[PDB]
Coordinates of C-alpha atoms and ligand atoms in Angstrom, one line a residue:
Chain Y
X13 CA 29.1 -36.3 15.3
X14 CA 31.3 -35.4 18.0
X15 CA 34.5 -36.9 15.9
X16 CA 33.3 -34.8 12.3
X17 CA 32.9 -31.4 14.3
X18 CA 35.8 -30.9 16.3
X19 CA 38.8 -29.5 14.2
X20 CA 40.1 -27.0 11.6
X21 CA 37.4 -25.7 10.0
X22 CA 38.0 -22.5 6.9
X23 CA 35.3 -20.3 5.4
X24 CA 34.8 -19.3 1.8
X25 CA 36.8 -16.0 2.8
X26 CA 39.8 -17.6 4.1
X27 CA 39.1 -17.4 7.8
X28 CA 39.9 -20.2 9.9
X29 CA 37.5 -22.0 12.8
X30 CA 39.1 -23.9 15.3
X31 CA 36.9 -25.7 17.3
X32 CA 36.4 -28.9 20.0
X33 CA 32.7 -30.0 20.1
X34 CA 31.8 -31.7 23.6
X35 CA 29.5 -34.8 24.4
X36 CA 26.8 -32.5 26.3
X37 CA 26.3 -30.2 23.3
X38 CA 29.2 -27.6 23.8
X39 CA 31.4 -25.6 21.3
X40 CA 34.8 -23.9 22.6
X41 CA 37.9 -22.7 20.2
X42 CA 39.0 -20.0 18.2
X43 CA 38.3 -17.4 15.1
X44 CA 40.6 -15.9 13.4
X45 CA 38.8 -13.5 10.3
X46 CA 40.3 -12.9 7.3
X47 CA 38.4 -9.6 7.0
X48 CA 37.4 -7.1 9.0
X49 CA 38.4 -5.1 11.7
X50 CA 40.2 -8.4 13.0
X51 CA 43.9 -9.3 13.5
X52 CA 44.8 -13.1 15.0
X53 CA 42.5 -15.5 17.0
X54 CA 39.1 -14.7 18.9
X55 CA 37.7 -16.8 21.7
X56 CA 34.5 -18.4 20.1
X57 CA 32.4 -20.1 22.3
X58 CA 28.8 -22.3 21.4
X59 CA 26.2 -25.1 21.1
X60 CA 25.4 -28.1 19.0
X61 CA 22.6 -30.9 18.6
X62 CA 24.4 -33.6 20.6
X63 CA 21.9 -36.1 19.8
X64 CA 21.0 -34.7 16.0
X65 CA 18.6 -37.0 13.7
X66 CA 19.7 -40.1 11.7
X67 CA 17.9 -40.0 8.6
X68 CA 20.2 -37.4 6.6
X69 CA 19.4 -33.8 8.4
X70 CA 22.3 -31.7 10.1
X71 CA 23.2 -31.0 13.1
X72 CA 22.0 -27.5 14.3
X73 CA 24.6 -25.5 15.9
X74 CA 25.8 -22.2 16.5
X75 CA 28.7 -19.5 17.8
X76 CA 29.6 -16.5 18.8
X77 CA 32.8 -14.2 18.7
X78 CA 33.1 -11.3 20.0
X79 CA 35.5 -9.2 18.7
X80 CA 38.4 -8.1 21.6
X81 CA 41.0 -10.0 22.0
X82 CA 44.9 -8.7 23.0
X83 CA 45.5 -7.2 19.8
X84 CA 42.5 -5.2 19.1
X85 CA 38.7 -4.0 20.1
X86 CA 36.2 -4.2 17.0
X87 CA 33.4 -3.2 19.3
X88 CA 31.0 -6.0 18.0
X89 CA 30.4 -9.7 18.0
X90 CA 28.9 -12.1 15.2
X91 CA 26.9 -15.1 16.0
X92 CA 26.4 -18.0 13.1
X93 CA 23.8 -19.9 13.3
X94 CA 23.9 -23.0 10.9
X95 CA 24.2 -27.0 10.7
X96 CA 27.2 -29.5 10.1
X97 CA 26.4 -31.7 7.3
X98 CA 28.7 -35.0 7.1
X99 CA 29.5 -37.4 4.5
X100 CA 33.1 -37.0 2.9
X101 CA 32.8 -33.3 1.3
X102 CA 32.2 -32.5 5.0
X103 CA 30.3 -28.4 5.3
X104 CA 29.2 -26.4 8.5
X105 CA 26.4 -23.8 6.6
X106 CA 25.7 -20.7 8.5
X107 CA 24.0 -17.6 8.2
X108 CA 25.2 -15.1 10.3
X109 CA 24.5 -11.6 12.3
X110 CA 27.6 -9.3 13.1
X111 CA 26.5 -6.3 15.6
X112 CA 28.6 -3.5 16.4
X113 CA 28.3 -0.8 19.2
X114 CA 26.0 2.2 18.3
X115 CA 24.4 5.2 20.1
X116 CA 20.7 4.6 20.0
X117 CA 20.3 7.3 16.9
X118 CA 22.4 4.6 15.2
X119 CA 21.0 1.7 16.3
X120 CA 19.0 1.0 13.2
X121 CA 22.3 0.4 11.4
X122 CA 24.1 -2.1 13.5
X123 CA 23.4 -5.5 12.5
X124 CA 25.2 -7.2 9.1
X125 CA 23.4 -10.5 7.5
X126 CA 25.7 -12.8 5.4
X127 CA 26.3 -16.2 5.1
X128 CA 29.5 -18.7 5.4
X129 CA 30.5 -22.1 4.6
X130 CA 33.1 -23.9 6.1
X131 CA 34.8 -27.3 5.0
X132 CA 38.2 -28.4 6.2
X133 CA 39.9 -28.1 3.3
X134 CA 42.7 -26.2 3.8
Chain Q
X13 CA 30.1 -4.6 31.8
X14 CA 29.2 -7.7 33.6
X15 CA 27.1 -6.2 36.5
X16 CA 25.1 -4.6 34.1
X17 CA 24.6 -7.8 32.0
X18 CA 24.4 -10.4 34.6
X19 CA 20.7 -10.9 35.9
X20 CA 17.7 -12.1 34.8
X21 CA 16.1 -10.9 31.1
X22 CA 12.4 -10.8 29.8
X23 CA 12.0 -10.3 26.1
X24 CA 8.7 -9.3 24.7
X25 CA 7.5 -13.1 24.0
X26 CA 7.7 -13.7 27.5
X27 CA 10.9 -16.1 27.4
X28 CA 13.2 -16.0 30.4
X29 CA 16.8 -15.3 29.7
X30 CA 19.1 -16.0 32.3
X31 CA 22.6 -15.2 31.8
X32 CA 26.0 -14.5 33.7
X33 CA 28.7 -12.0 32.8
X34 CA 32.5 -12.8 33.2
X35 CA 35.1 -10.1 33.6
X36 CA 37.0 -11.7 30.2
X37 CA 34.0 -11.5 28.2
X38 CA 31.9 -14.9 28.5
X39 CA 28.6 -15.6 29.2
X40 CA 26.8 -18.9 30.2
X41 CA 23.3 -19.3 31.4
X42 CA 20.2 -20.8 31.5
X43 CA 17.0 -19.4 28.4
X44 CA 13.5 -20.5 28.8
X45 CA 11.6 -19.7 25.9
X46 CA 7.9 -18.9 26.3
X47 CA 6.7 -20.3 22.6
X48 CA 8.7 -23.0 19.9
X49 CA 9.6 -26.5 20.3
X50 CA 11.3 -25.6 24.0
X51 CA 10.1 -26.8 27.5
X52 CA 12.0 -25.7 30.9
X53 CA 15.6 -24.7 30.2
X54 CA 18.0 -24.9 27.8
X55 CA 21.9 -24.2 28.5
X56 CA 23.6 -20.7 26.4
X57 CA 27.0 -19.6 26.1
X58 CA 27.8 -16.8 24.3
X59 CA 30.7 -13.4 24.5
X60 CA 30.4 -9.7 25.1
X61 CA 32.8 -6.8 24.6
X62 CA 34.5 -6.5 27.9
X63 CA 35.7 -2.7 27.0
X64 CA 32.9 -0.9 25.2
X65 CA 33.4 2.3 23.2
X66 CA 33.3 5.2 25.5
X67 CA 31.2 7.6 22.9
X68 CA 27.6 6.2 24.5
X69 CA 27.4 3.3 22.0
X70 CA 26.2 0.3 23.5
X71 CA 27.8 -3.2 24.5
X72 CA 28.1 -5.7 21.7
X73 CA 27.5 -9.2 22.2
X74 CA 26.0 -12.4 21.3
X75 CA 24.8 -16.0 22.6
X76 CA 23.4 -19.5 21.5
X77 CA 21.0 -21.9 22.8
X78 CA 21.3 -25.5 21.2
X79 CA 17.2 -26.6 21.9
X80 CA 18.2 -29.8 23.5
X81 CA 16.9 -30.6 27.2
X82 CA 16.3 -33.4 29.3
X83 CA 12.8 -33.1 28.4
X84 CA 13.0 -32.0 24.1
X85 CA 14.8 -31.7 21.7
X86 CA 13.8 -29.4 18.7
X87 CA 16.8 -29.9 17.1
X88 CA 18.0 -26.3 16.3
X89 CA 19.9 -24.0 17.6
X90 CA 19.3 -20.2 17.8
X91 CA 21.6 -17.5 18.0
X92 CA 21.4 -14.0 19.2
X93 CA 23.5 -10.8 18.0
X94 CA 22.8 -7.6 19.3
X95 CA 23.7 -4.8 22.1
X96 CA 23.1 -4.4 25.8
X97 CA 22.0 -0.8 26.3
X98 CA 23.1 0.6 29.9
X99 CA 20.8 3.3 31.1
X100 CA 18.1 3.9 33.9
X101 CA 16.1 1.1 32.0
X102 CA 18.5 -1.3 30.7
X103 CA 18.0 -2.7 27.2
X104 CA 19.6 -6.1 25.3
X105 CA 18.2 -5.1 21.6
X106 CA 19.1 -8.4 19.1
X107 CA 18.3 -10.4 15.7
X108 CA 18.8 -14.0 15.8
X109 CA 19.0 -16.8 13.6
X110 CA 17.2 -19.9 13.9
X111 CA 18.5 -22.9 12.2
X112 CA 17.1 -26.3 12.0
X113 CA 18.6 -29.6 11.0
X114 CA 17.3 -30.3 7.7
X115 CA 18.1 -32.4 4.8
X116 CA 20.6 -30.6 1.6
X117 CA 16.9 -30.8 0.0
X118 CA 15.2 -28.7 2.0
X119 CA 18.4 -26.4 3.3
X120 CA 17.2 -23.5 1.5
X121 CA 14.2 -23.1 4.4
X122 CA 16.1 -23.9 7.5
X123 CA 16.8 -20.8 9.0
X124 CA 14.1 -18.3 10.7
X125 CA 15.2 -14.9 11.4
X126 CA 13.5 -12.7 14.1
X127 CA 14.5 -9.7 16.6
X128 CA 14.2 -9.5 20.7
X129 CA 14.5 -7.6 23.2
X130 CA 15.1 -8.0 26.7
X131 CA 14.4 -6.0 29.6
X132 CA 14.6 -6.4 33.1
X133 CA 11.0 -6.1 33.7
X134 CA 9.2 -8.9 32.7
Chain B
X12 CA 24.0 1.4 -18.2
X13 CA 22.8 -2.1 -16.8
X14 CA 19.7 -2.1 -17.7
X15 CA 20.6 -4.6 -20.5
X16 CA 22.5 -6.7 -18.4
X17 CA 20.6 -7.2 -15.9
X18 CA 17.5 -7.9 -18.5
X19 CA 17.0 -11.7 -19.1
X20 CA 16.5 -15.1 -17.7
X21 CA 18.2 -15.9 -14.7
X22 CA 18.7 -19.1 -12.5
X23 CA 19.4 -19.7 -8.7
X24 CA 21.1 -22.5 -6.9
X25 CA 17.5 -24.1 -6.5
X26 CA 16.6 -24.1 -9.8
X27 CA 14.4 -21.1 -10.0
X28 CA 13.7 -19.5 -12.8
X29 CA 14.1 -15.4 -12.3
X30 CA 12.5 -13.6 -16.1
X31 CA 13.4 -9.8 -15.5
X32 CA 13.5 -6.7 -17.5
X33 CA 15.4 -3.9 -16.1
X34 CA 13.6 -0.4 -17.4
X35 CA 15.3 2.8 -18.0
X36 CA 14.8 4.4 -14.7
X37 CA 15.5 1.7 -12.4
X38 CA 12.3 -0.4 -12.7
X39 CA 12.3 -4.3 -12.3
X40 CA 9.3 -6.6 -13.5
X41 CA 8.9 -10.1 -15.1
X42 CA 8.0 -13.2 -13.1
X43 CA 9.9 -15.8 -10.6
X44 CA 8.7 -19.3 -11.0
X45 CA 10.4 -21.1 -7.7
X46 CA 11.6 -24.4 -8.4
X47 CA 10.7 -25.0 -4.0
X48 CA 8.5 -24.6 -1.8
X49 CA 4.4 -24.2 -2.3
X50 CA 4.6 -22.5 -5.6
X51 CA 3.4 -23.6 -9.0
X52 CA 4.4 -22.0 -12.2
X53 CA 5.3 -17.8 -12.7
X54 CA 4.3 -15.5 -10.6
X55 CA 4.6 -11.8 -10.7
X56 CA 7.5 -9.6 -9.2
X57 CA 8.6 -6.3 -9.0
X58 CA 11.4 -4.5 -8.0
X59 CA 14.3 -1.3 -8.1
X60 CA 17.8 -1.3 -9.1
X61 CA 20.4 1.8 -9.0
X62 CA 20.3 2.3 -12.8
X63 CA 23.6 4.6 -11.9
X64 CA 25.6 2.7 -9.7
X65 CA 29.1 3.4 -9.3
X66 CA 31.8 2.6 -11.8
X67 CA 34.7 1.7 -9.0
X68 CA 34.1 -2.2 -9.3
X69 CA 31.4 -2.1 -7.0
X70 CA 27.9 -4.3 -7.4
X71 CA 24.5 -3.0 -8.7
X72 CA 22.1 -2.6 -5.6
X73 CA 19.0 -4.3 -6.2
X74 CA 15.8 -5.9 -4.7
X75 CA 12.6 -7.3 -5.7
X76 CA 9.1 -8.9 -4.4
X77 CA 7.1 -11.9 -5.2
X78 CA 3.9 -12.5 -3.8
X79 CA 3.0 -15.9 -3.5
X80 CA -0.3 -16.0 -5.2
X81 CA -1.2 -16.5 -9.3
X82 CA -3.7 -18.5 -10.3
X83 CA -2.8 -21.4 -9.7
X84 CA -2.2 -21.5 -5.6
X85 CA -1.6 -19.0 -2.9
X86 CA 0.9 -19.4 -0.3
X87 CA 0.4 -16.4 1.9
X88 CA 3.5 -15.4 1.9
X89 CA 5.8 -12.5 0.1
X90 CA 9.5 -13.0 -0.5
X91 CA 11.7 -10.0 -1.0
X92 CA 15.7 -10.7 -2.1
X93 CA 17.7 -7.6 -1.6
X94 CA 21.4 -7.8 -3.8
X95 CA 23.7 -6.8 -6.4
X96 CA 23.8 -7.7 -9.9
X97 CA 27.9 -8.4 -10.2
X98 CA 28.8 -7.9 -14.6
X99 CA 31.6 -8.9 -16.5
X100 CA 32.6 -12.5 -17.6
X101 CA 29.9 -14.1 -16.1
X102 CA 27.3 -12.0 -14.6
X103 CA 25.8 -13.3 -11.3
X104 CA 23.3 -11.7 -9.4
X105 CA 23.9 -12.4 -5.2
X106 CA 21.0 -12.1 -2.8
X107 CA 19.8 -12.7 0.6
X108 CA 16.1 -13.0 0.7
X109 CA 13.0 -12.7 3.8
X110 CA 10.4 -15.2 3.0
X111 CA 7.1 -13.6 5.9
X112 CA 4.2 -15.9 6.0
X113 CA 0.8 -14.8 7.4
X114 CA 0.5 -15.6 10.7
X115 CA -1.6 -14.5 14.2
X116 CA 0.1 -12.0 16.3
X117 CA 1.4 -14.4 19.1
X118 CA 3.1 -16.7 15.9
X119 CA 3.9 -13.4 14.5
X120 CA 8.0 -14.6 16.1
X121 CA 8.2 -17.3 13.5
X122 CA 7.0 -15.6 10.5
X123 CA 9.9 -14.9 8.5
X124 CA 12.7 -17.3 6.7
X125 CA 16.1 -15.6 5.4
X126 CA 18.6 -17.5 3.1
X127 CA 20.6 -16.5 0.1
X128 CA 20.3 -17.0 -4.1
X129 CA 22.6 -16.7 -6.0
X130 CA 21.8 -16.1 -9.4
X131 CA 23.4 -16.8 -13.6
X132 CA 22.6 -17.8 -16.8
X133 CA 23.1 -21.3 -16.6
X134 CA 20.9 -24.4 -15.6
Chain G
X11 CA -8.8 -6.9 -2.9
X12 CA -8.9 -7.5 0.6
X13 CA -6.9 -4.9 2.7
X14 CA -6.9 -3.0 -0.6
X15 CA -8.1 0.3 1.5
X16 CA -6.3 -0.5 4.6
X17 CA -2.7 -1.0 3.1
X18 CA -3.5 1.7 1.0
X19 CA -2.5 5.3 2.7
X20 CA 0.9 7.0 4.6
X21 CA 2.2 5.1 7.5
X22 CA 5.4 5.8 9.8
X23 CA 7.8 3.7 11.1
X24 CA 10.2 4.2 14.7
X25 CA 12.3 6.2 13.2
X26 CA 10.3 8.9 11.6
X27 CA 10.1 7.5 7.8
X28 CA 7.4 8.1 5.7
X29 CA 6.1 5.3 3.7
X30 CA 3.2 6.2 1.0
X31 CA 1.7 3.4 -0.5
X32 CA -0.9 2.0 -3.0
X33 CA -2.7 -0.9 -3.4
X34 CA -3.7 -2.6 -6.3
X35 CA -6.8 -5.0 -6.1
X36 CA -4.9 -7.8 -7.7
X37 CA -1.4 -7.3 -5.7
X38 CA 0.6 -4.7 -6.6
X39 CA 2.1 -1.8 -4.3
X40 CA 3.3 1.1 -5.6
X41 CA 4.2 4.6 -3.4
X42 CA 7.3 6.6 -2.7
X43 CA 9.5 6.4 0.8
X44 CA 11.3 9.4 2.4
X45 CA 13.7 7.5 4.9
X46 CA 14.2 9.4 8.0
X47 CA 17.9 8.4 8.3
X48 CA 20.6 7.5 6.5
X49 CA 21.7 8.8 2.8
X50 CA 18.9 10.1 1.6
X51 CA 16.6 12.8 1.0
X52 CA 12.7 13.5 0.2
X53 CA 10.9 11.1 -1.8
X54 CA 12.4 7.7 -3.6
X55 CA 9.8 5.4 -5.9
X56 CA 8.9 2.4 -4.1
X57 CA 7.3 -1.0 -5.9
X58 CA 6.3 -4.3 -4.2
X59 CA 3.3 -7.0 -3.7
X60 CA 0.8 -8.1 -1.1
X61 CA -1.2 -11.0 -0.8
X62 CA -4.4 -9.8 -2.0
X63 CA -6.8 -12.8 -0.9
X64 CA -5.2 -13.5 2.9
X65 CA -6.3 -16.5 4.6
X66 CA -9.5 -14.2 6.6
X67 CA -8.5 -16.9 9.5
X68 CA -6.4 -14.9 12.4
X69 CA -3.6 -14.6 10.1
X70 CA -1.3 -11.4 9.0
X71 CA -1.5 -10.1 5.3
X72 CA 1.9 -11.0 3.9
X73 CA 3.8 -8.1 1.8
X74 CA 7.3 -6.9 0.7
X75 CA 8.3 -4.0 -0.8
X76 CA 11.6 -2.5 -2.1
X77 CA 13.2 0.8 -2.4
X78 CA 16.6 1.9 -4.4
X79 CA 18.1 5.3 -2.9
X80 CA 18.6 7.0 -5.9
X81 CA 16.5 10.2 -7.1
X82 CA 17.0 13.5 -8.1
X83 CA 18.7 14.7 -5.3
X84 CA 20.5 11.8 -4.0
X85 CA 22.1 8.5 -5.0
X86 CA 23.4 6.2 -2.3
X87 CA 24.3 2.9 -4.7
X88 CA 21.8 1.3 -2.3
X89 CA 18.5 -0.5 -1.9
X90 CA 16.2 -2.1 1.0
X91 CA 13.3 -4.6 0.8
X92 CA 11.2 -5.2 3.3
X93 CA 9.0 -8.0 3.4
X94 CA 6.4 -8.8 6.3
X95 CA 2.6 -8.2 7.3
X96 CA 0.3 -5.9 7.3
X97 CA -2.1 -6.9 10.6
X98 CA -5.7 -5.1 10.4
X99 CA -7.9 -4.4 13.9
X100 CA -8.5 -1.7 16.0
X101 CA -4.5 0.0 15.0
X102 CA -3.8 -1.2 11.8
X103 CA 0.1 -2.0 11.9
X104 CA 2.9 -3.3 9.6
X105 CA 5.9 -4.9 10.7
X106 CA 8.6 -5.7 8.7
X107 CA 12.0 -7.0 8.6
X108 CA 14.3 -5.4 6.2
X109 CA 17.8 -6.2 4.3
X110 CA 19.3 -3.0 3.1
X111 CA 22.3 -4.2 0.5
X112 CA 25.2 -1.8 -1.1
X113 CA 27.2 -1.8 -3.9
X114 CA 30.5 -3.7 -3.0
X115 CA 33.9 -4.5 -4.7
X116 CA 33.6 -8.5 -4.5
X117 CA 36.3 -8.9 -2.1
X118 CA 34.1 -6.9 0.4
X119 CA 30.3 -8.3 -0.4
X120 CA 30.8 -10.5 2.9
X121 CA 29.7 -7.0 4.5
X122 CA 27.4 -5.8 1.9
X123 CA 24.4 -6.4 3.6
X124 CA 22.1 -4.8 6.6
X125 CA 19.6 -6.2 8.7
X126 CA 17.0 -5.0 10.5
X127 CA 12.7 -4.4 11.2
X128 CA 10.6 -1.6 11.4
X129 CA 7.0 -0.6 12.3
X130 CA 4.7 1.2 10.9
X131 CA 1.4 2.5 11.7
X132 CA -0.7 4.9 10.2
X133 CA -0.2 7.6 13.0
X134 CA 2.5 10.5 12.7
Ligands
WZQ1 O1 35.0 -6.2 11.3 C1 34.7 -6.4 12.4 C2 35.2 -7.7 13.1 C3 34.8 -9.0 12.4 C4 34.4 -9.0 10.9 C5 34.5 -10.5 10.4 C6 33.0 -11.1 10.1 S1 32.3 -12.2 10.9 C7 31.2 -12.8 9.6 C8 32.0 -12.9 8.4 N1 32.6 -14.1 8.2 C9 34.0 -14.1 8.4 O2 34.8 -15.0 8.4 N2 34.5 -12.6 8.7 C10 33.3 -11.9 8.6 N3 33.9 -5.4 13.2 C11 33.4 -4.2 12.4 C12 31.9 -4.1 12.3 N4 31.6 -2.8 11.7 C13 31.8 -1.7 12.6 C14 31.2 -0.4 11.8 C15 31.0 0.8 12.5 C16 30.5 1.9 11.7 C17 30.3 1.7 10.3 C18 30.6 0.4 9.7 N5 31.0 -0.6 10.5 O3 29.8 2.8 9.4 C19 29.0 3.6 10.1 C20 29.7 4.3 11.3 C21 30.3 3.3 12.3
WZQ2 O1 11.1 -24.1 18.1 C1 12.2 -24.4 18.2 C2 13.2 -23.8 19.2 C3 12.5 -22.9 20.2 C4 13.1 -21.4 20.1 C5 12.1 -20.3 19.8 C6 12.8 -19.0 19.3 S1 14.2 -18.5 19.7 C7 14.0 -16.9 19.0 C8 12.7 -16.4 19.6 N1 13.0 -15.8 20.8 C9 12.4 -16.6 21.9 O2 12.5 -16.3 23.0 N2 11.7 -17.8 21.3 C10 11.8 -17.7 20.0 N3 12.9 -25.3 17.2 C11 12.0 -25.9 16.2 C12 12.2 -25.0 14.9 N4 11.3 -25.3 13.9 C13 11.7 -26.5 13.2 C14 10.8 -26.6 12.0 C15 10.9 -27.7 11.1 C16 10.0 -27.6 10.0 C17 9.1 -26.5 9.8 C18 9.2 -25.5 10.7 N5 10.0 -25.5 11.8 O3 8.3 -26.5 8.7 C19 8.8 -27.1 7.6 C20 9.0 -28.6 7.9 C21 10.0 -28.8 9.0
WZQ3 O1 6.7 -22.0 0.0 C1 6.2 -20.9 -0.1 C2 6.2 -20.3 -1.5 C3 7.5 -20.4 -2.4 C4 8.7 -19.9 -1.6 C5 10.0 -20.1 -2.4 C6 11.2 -19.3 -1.7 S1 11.6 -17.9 -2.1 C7 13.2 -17.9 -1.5 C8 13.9 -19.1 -2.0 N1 14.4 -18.9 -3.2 C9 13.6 -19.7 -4.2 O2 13.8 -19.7 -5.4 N2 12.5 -20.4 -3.5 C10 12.6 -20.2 -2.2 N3 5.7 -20.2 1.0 C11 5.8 -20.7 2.4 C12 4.4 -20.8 3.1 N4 4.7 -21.6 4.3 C13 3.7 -21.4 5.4 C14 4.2 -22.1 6.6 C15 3.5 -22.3 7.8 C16 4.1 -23.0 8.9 C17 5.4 -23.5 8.7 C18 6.0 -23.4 7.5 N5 5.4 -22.7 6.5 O3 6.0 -24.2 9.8 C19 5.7 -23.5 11.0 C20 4.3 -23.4 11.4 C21 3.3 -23.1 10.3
WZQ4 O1 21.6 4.7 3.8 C1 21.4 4.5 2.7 C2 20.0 4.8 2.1 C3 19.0 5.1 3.2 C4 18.6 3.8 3.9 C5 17.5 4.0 4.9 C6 17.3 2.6 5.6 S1 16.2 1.7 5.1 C7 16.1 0.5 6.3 C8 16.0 1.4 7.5 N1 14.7 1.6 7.6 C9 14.5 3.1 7.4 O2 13.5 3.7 7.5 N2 15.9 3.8 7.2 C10 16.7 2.8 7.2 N3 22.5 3.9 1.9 C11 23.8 3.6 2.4 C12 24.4 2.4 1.8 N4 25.6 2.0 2.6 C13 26.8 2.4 2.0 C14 28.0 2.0 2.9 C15 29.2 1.6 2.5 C16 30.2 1.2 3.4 C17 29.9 1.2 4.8 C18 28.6 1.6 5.2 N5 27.7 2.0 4.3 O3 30.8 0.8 5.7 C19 32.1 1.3 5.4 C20 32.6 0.7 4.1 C21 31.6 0.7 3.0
BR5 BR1 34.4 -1.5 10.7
BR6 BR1 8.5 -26.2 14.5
BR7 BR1 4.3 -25.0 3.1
BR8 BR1 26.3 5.4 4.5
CL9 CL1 23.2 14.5 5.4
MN10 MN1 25.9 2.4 6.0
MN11 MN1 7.0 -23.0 4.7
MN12 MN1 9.8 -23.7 12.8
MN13 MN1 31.0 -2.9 9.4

């Protein structure tokens, strides 16, 4: 799995995942949004199954961004949390949580739910 | 910042979250999780907002534990989004996504969503 | 305004089968029969929509319910899918959805599943 | 039903909300919600379900429930369901998770859609 994971990975909004998967269940790389309060790359850092099941089921895995990088601050990080499904029309599925900063009177509203799928199709 | 982050975390299930702060965002550590498929430790990696607003709001951030040990593996990942509160009690308030390796069959049901939060009491 | 399109049989990704009618002041009823899970045949749902959303290109809000229990089983468990019905061409209804199962307090942590549905008028 | 008469009555989440509910015996809840934050003001018409014949074997009694924000007064192009449990005993409590979803342009429903839980007991 280590082979299928690591590379150029783009979401069904245009953003691009660059990422290297490591034999002891690590994920390093770069974001870069196509939305959002988000201008260039982001360091991404994250986990994977590094010994997933054989008989058909992803591998679990999941990332996080947060949001600063030398450009600008968004004040918030997003976390996916999904599974890498092989075969030849190869998909990472996630769902995913974006929090931003808020006072506590705010707090209630901080959190976004969505959901991305990646392929490496350009 | 990462004084305030760095330590060790007790959310209200009783899991152990152990987790370092670096000055450029990162954080790495150790979660022990109190109920689930999970047994000792599990290694995390995850980013933080270096430079928070400076209207109160509180610290974004986000990490994931891939539930592989020595000793299990569940094989799912969770990750965490939410905000480290600074104050006279410090607070980490989050939603996470669970995610388990399923067949495309049963995709539809392989993600549990849930909120923590951590304090520095247990 | 919507009411009539959002009236009608609708089908998810899964296969579900989503019978709604849309009533003048933002009621929704009809039945969900889920093509997954521990379900058998229709059961009943309810719901809201903004019967006057905006006219700037933006989405219908909507949400409904579904208790898993007719006569036929009873799953204990409620699903609720929060979403906007999206006109024109083809008309699609997009949704993320909490599935919350009964459970004791100390499994109370692993009690609710989210995913996404996305609904049309075909298959 | 079972939990008929429990669910049934005015409960108030951690924010201050106000959530006034009825119980049908066969499943049905219907009430009105004044939301203590946000865009919105005094009552909006609520509708949902509850399991009416819970397993009576430790476990919660499973609900949802959803509201759109639009009355008389206000209309916020907006609506939250919250789905969840409704745990009898000595405090009676419901705890929910909720998704609170917008009206968006399609080239901005990636962000259409909030997250979040709330509590509510029967005390003020
Ligand atoms: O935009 C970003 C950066 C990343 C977005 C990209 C995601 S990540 C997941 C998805 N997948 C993908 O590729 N891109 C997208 N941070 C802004 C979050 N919001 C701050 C805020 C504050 C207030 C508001 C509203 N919002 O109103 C109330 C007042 C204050
Ligand atoms: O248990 C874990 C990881 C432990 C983490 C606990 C969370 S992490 C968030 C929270 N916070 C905290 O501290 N602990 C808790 N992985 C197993 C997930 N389950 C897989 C599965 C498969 C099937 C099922 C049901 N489940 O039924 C259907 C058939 C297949
Ligand atoms: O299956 C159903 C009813 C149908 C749902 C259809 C959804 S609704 C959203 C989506 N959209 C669509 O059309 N169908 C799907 N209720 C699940 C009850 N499960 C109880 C339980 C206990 C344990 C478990 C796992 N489960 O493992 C962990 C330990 C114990
Ligand atoms: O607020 C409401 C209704 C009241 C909700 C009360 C909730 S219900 C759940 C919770 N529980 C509880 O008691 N009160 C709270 N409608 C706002 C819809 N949002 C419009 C919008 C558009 C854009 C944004 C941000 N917002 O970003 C900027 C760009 C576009
Ligand atoms: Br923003
Ligand atoms: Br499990
Ligand atoms: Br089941
Ligand atoms: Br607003
Ligand atoms: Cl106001
Ligand atoms: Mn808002
Ligand atoms: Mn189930
Ligand atoms: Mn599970
Ligand atoms: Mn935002």
């Amino acid at each position: 799995d280590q082979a299928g994971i690591t590379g150029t990975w783009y979401n069904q909004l245009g953003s691009t995942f660059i990422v290297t998967a490591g034999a002891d269940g690590a994920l390093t790389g770069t974001y870069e949004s196509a939305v959002g309060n988000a201008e260039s790359r982001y360091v991404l850092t994250g986990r994977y199954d590094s010994a997933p099941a054989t008989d058909g089921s992803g591998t679990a895995l999941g990332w996080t961004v947060a949001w600063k990088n030398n450009y600008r601050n968004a004040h918030s990080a997003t976390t996916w949390s999904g599974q890498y499904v092989g075969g030849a029309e190869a998909r990472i599925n996630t769902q995913w949580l974006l929090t931003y900063g808020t006072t506590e009177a705010n707090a209630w509203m901080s959190t976004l739910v969505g959901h991305d799928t990646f392929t490496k199709v350009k």
